[PDB]
Curated annotation (Swiss-Prot), chains B, D:
This is Dynamin-1. Belongs to the TRAFAC class dynamin-like GTPase superfamily. Dynamin/Fzo/YdjA family. The gene is DNM1. The dynamin-type G mediates homodimerization and plays a role in self-assembly. The C-terminal proline-rich domain (PRD) mediates interaction with SH3-binding partners. Is required for DNM1 self-assembly. It is linked to Developmental and epileptic encephalopathy 31A: An autosomal dominant epileptic encephalopathy, a heterogeneous group of severe early-onset epilepsies characterized by refractory seizures, neurodevelopmental impairment, and poor prognosis. Development is normal prior to seizure onset, after which cognitive and motor delays become apparent. Developmental and epileptic encephalopathy 31B: A form of epileptic encephalopathy, a heterogeneous group of severe early-onset epilepsies characterized by refractory seizures, neurodevelopmental impairment, and poor prognosis. Development is normal prior to seizure onset, after which cognitive and motor delays become apparent. DEE31B is an autosomal recessive form with onset in the first months of life. Coiled coil: none annotated.
């Protein structure tokens, strides 16, 4: 019943919920992986079509 | 089949990353709400045993 | 896992979370009750002398 | 003693009602989270018996 009401009262609500560096690095690696993987499936498609 | 399986296991997550912005109060708010919900539920499960 | 995100993602959360008028009346009535009870208790405590 | 009991009963809710401000997105967010949690709990109660 109370925990969220207290979290809204802490600090200045500007630095709270700020991502760590590791999440930013994981984000970049995941986006790179996603785009390269779609490219691999596009090339397999083109090869099967000929 | 292997490449499609990996894409299926990444695509559900990378949707948040593709639109990632350094300034997004709605993303921060909903992440806060989901994490607070998960904390309360995990604590209750862990101590009650349900 | 998802219902919360689906509800929050809707636009105009202000309209989405408008309180019923009955609730707007009930909370005001409780505020009046609280102030009147404190005033009555102060009077009783003072008269006791 | 009667007046003290009535004040003790009402205080828990007037403490929140006295702080109402129409322009408060945090109050709205707290209500949203509480109502969603109540829904999920009632659904699990009625389907699984937990």
């Amino acid at each position: 019943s109370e925990l969220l009401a207290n979290l809204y009262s802490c600090g200045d609500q500007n630095t709270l919920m700020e991502e760590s560096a590791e999440q930013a690095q994981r984000r970049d690696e995941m986006l790179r992986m996603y785009h390269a993987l779609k490219e691999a499936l596009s090339i397999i498609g083109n090869i099967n079509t000929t | 089949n292997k490449l499609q399986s990996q894409l299926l296991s990444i695509e559900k997550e990378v949707e948040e990353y593709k639109n990632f912005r350094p300034d997004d109060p709605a993303r921060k708010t909903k992440a806060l709400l989901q994490m607070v919900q998960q904390f309360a539920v995990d604590f209750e499960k862990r101590i009650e045993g349900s």
